[PDB]
RNA sequence: GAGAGACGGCUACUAAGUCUAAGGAUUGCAGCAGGGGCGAAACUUGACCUAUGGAUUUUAUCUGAGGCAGUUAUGGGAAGUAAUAUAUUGUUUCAUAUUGUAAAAGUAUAUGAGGUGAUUAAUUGGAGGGCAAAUCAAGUGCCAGCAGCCGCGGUAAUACUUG
RNA sequence: ACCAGGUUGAUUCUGCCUGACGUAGACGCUAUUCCCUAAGAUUAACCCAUGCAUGUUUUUGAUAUGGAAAAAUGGACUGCUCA
């Protein structure tokens with residue numbers, strides 16, 4: 001008297017929205033370059049990391 | 057593994073510290089390095105002579121002050137991290153190993169051919185040097201080098217020029 | 228191993244022969260002679276490495292069969308002849 | 316664009332093999348490494364022996380330096396050059412496959428006689 | 441037993457006390473060759489027989505989906521846990537599976553009782569990729 | 579036979595066989611390739627005496643010892659996927675000479691064209707604490723599921739599913 | 742030459758579990774170069790189709806201008822595996 005009929009109920013039920021294409025992300029030392037100049041303008045080194053990076 | 061296939065450097069002990077990633081990222085953006093891995097290679101040999109500098113201060117052998125310690129001071133002086141000292145005098149040999157403990161990682165990281173171009177007037181930025189070396193436009197006195205992490209010795213410092221027959225010049 | 232050995236290895240070669248421990252695998256096991264195992268060297272290494280008269284195996288036979296080589300006042304044409312200490 | 320210069324380093328004389336040895340130095344300033352046809356012509360002016368008696372080999376370019384190294388062997392006449400050199404080093408200046416030589420040798424050690432006997436037993440049948 | 445010439449009495453005494461180490465005791469008796477469930481290897485193969493579910497312990501409440509298989513190397517029967525949502529719909533009977541362990545030194549972790557193995561491959565198709573939707577099941 | 583209790587030498591028994599005109603005859607891949615079984619688990623039924631060696635003088639005889647190439651995320655190195663301010667210049671994916679090779683590759687030196695970094699040119703794992711990073715949005719409501727340990731899920735979930 | 746989370750309404754200890762880090766094998770997803778280095782050991786020292794790995798030498802000279810046999814010399818080294 002154990003039910004197995006409800007296998008996979010939630011994932012097939014939620015509707016699918018499509019992906020949105022993005023620009024080609026830079027890779028290499030230029031990827032480390034875009035991350036370093038972006039941190040230096042907001043003073044991330046001076047306040048010793050006490051801020052929120054992912055802001056949305 | 058075998059001698060040709062062992063690894064040189066491991067991961068750090070603590071993977072996530074906010075007090076370590078901030079200090080190291082100041083070094084990557086300043087000197088222009090692409091990987092966190094290639095930073096780890098230049099610091100281990102910085103650790104290895106400091107492992108040897110402590111032993112020569114505590115040696116009780118009468119000849120170890122003459123031979124291996126004088127064979128320590130030269131190898132840095134040829135690459136030119138140390139400036140120069142008189143090896144005949146005994147008391148300055150004691151000063152040479154005492155000056156060794158006051159170095160940093162930047163004393164090794166500054167004598168690289170990528171940074172040594174930009175500190176001269178040839179390059180505008182340090183990222184101007186990495187894009188210039190790999191195309192083959194920069195030459196030492198006879199040789200055309202394509203490795204930006206090539207260590208530059210002391211005597212070969214002033215003889216860095218452009219390649220005379222490249223398109224970076226007129227020809 | 229029911230008998231004698233006839234193949235020698237380059238890693239256990241004597242260092243006084245000044246050989247390279249590079250690409251080769253085997254080395255020449257010289258003949259029995261008057262000298263001991265330590266004070267002897269093969270002849271084919273002398274005409275190649277120390278003296279410089281030949282380049283490959285073919286030019287070794289040319290000088291040896293032309294009968295100019297004179298060890299202790301005797302002509303010899305075998306490349307495995309051991310040159311010992313003190314001989315002229 | 317073709318450039319070649321010759322500099323002679325370590326000239327030595329060999330009496331038993333009847334030859335001379337030297338190490339060459341090539342300056343190719345704005346050019347590739349030279350072909351061996353033109354360099355054999357250049358030694359015929361300095362060394363007055365015929366161009367056929369001269370052999371050169373092992374032209375290696377040092378990387379990114381525009382300068383290559385090679386070796387020179389010269390003889391007087393033509394016949395001793397065919398005698399003292401190797402075969403393929405001569406044939407570059409101017410056999411049977413392996414898998415067939417193994418088959419005929421194994422059939423040869425089978426027989427106890429000539430081909431006269433090998434047919435003679437087939438005559439009886 | 442502290443003395444200068446007492447090395448024979450020191451080694452004999454310290455070997456006795458070392459036998460009460462619970463990790464070292466299993467190394468002497470060799471229980472990993474005697475009482476191993478799966479053998480001595482990272483994975484195994486099997487043939488599915490049932491598709492049944494179990495109920496987890498208190499205070500949580502759910503139904504955990506498992507499968508009873510039979511191994512090839514030894515021939516025993518064992519149960520394994522299907523590790524992702526909606527993945528049992530691929531599985532049919534009279535089929536082959538590959539089994540991987542949990543990583544807690546031979547014990548059961550989570551609130552799943554008495555089960556120490558989980559399925560990784562079905563018909564040489566990766567179940568982690570098939571949940572993502574990269575491949576299709578034949 | 580100088581040296582074998584030898585197995586690419588011989589004799590017998592035991593376990594497995596194969597050919598036949600039925601009287602008899604015959605085989606040992608823990609040698610190199612290759613197939614079968616076993617398993618979670620491991621490559622070309624390829625060319626050659628160039629270099630190092632052995633066979634009683636080894637410059638032309640033999641050498642699956644030993645070199646030279648093909649298949650594979652077994653690991654370690656030198657490097658790429660941009661730089662200066664839309665634009666300028668110019669690294670790889672293309673070809674060709676010479677050097678080289680036992681004969682063929684490949685590397686190095688030089689030379690050709692075409693014009694693109696949303697491109698031929700970046701992925702894997704994670705976002706409550708340990709432990710760097712969202713109380714962002716939409717669905718489901720102790721179900722479906724996640725979690726090495728502590729622990730979330732009862733119609734406002736930063737702890738499941740998608741974006 | 743370095744420690745963190747977990748027993749209680751809250752505190753201090755003993756004690757264990759877990760996280761962080763190495764070395765050999767297998768596996769999932771994704772891959773542009775070049776040089777170096779490796780590949781049926783773990784279970785089965787289990788069975789093998791086919792092709793190939795040990796012959797040289799005027800010492801004499803086959804009714805035979807250069808090869809039949811006989812003599813001589815080495816096949817006991819080298820290579821493979823770990824019962």
Ligand SMILES: [Mg+2]
Pocket residue numbers: 543
């Ligand atoms: Mg673990």
Ligand SMILES: [Mg+2]
Pocket residue numbers: none
């Ligand atoms: Mg044997």
Ligand SMILES: [Mg+2]
Pocket residue numbers: none
């Ligand atoms: Mg034996």
Ligand SMILES: [Mg+2]
Pocket residue numbers: 585
């Ligand atoms: Mg026997």
Ligand SMILES: [Mg+2]
Pocket residue numbers: 586607
């Ligand atoms: Mg055999």
Ligand SMILES: [Mg+2]
Pocket residue numbers: 607
């Ligand atoms: Mg085999």
Ligand SMILES: [Mg+2]
Pocket residue numbers: 620
């Ligand atoms: Mg493998």
Ligand SMILES: [Mg+2]
Pocket residue numbers: none
């Ligand atoms: Mg992602």
Ligand SMILES: [Mg+2]
Pocket residue numbers: none
């Ligand atoms: Mg935090």
Ligand SMILES: [Mg+2]
Pocket residue numbers: 726
């Ligand atoms: Mg986990």
Ligand SMILES: [Mg+2]
Pocket residue numbers: none
């Ligand atoms: Mg989490």
Ligand SMILES: [Mg+2]
Pocket residue numbers: none
């Ligand atoms: Mg085996």
Ligand SMILES: [Mg+2]
Pocket residue numbers: 811
């Ligand atoms: Mg005979």
Ligand SMILES: [Mg+2]
Pocket residue numbers: none
């Ligand atoms: Mg074993």
Ligand SMILES: [Mg+2]
Pocket residue numbers: none
């Ligand atoms: Mg055993």
